[PDB]
Amino acid sequence: VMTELILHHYATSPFSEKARLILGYKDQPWKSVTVPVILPKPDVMPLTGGYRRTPFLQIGADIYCDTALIAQVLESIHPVPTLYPADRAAAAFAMAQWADTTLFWAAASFVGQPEGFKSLMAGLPEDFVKAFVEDRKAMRAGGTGLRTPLPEAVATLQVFLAQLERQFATGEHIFLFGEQPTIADFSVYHALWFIRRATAVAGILDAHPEVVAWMHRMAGFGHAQAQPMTPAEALAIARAATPRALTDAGAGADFDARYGLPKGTRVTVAATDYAVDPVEGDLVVSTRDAVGVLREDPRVGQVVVHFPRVGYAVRKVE
Amino acid sequence: VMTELILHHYATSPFSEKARLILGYKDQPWKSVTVPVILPKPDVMPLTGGYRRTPFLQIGADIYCDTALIAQVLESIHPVPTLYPADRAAAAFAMAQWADTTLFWAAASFVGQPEGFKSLMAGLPEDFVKAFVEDRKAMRAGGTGLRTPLPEAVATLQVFLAQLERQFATGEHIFLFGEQPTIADFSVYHALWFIRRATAVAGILDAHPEVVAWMHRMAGFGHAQAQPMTPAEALAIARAATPRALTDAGAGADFDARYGLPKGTRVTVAATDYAVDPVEGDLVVSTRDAVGVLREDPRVGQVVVHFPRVGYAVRKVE
Ligand SMILES: N[C@@H](CCC(=O)N[C@@H](CS)C(=O)NCC(=O)O)C(=O)O
Ligand SMILES: N[C@@H](CCC(=O)N[C@@H](CS)C(=O)NCC(=O)O)C(=O)O
Ligand SMILES: [Zn+2]
Ligand SMILES: [Zn+2]
Ligand SMILES: [Zn+2]
Ligand SMILES: [Zn+2]
Ligand SMILES: [Zn+2]
Ligand SMILES: [Zn+2]
Ligand SMILES: [Zn+2]
Ligand SMILES: [Zn+2]
Numbered sequence A, B: 001v002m003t004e005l006i007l008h009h010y011a012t013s014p015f016s017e018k019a020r021l022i023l024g025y026k027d028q029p030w031k032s033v034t035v036p037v038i039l040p041k042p043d044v045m046p047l048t049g050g051y052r053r054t055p056f057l058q059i060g061a062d063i064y065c066d067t068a069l070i071a072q073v074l075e076s077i078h079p080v081p082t083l084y085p086a087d088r089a090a091a092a093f094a095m096a097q098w099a100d101t102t103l104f105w106a107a108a109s110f111v112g113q114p115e116g117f118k119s120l121m122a123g124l125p126e127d128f129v130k131a132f133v134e135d136r137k138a139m140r141a142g143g144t145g146l147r148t149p150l151p152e153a154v155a156t157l158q159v160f161l162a163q164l165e166r167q168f169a170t171g172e173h174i175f176l177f178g179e180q181p182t183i184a185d186f187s188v189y190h191a192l193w194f195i196r197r198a199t200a201v202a203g204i205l206d207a208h209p210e211v212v213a214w215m216h217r218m219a220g221f222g223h224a225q226a227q228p229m230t231p232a233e234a235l236a237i238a239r240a241a242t243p244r245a246l247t248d249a250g251a252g253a254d255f256d257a258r259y260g261l262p263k264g265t266r267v268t269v270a271a272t273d274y275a276v277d278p279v280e281g282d283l284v285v286s287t288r289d290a291v292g293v294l295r296e297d298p299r300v301g302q303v304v305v306h307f308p309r310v311g312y313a314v315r316k317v318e
Helices: A014-025 A067-077 A086-112 A114-120 A126-139 A150-169 A183-197 A209-219 A231-240 B014-025 B067-077 B086-112 B114-120 B126-139 B150-169 B183-197 B209-219 B231-240
Strands: A006-009 A030-034 A056-059 A062-065 A226-228 A266-271 A279-286 A290-297 A301-308 A312-316 B006-009 B030-034 B056-059 B062-065 B226-228 B266-271 B279-286 B290-297 B301-308 B312-316
Touching (some): A014 A086, A030 A231, A056 A067, A056 A231, A062 A067, A150 A209, A150 B086, A183 A209, B006 B014, B006 B231, B056 B231, B183 B209, B279 B301
Parallel strands (some): A030 A226, A062 A301, B006 B030, B062 B301
Antiparallel strands (some): A266 A279, A266 A312, A290 A301, B056 B062, B266 B279
C-alpha cells in the first residue's frame, strides 16, 4: 500500500499538533511515524533531502513539508468540511500566516523563560535538555524568525489574547469565522496549546475564559484514527513508490512557469525564517502556491519534495 | 486652538495614505503638516524625540506615532463608524498586522525593482533619488523588516492577491469583513495603493478585477477636510500645550504596571523592524496596547510621545 497518509511528527511538537488536529477535523485515518526531536535524523533525510523541521506528510514517494502545505493536501483529499471557506479566503490566509509566524514566535519566547522552560523539560534527562538547547540555537543560524525577546513576546501575547477574548465574548460564532473552524483557528490553536503545556506560565491563558473555552472546542476534534509505522517501513514505502509527477497521469499537470524557472531547472528550496537548510533537486512541480523538486536518494530512489512558496526561497543552482 | 488633529505626513507615503483614508472614513477634519521624505528632519525631532517615520498625529502636546496607534486614537474620537467591530476583533487585528508588515514589505520590494523604481522616481531630481536610496539603506541598519528579496516578494503578492480575489469573487461582502471596512481593509489597501503608483509594474493588480473594484470602493472614502499648517505653527502649538497625562483630569488615568515598569521610569522606546531610533523619556502613560513617554525639548517644552506596544521595544534606561 502506497496511498496511506503517513505523518512524520513527534508528540510535544506544536506544529505537529496542528496537523494532528486537522486530521481529526477531516476524520482522516493516518499512519504515525515518530521522528527525533533534534539532529541528527538519518531516517528523515533520505525523504526530505535536508529539511529537518517537523512535521511532514508522506504519501508514497511524495513528501509534503510545512503545515501550511500539509493542510492544503489534506483539504484536496477531504474537501468537506473545508478549512478554506471561499468567503473568508484572504482573512483566513493572512491570519494563519501571522499566527504561524509572529504569534508562534512570541509563544516560543514566552515559554522559553526559566519557569516555562523548566515545566517543558520536566521529565527529561539533562543530557537531552542541553542538546536540545544547542540544537535549537544552531537552528536559528540563518534566519530572522523565532527570536522575539521576552518583553516583546509578552506584549504580543497580552495584546492578541485580549482581542481574541473580545471577539469570542460577543458570542456571535464558536470559531474565528463561523460555526466551523478554518485554517486560522488551527494556526492560532497550536501556539496557545504550546503555552498551555508550559504549566508554570500557562496562567496567561486562564485570564481569558472565552479563549480557554474556544481551545476546548478545538481540542474536541481529536486526531482521528492512527496506527504506528516504523521509520524503516516508511522508507521502504517511498522506495517502492513513484512520485505523482512521474506517473503518466500526473505528468500532464499544469506547470506554472510565470515565476521564471522552467520545468526541469535544478534548484534549491530553503526556509527563510529559520532552519534554512537548502533542499536540492529538479523543479518538476510548480503551482501558484507551491513547488515540488525531484531528487534521488540511494535509499529511497526518486522522491518529490514539496514546499509552499510563502516562507521559502527557491533559487537556481549554478 | 490646541485640540485640532494635526497629521504630519507626505503625499507619496503609503502609510500616510492609510491614515488619510481613515480620516475620510471617519469624516474627521484635520490640519496638514508636510514633513521631509528623508533625513534630516529638524522640524520633526523636537516633537518625536528621534522617531523619524511617517506619519504621526499631533494633538496639542501629545504625539502619536505609528498608524496602528493613530487609528486607535481616531477611533477614540469618532467611534462610529467603527474600524474595530468587536465580532471580528482578533481576525482584523492579526490581518492588519500581517498587512502592515509582511505584505507591505513584499510590495516595497516588488516596487523597488528597476522598472518599478523608475516609475516612482519619474518626476524627481537625480540628487534626491540618490539621497533617497542612501537614506532608506541607513534606515534598514538595525532591523529585520523591509528586506524581502524580489522573488519571495513576487510569490507573496501572487499568493495573497489570489486569495483576496477569491474572497471578493463570492460577492458576499463589499469589504473584507462586511459592508463597512475595518482596520484590516485600510492596512491591505495602502500596500496595494503603493503598487498602483508604481505604474510600470502595476499590471499585477489588473489581473485581479475584484481586487481592483475593492480598491475603488476604498478610495471613495476620500480624505475628509484638511487645511495646511506650517511645521513652525505645529511646533508653537505643542509648545503652548500641556500633554494630557500632565493635566489634572488625565493624571488619574489607569496605569498598567503589569509589564514591570512603574510610572515615572526612565525608558527608551524603539521600533524593532526598521528605523530603530530610540526615543527616551519618562514612562507616564501605560495601557495594555500602548505606551507614552514624557520628554522635554528646549523648543516645545514638555510633550508625551505615544507608541503602540506591538512593533516596538520598551527598555529601562541605565
Ligand atoms: N512553518 C513550519 C514550521 C515547522 C516547525 O517549526 N516545527 C518545529 C517543531 S514544533 C521544528 O521543526 N523544530 C525543529 C525540529 O523539529 O527538528 C510549518 O508550519 O510546518
Ligand atoms: N509601522 C509604521 C510604519 C511607518 C513607515 O514605515 N512609514 C514610511 C513612510 S511610507 C517611513 O517612515 N519612511 C521613512 C521616513 O518617512 O522618513 C506605521 O504604521 O506608521
Ligand atoms: Zn517545536
Ligand atoms: Zn494532540
Ligand atoms: Zn478519505
Ligand atoms: Zn509494522
Ligand atoms: Zn514609504
Ligand atoms: Zn490620498
Ligand atoms: Zn469630531
Ligand atoms: Zn498659517
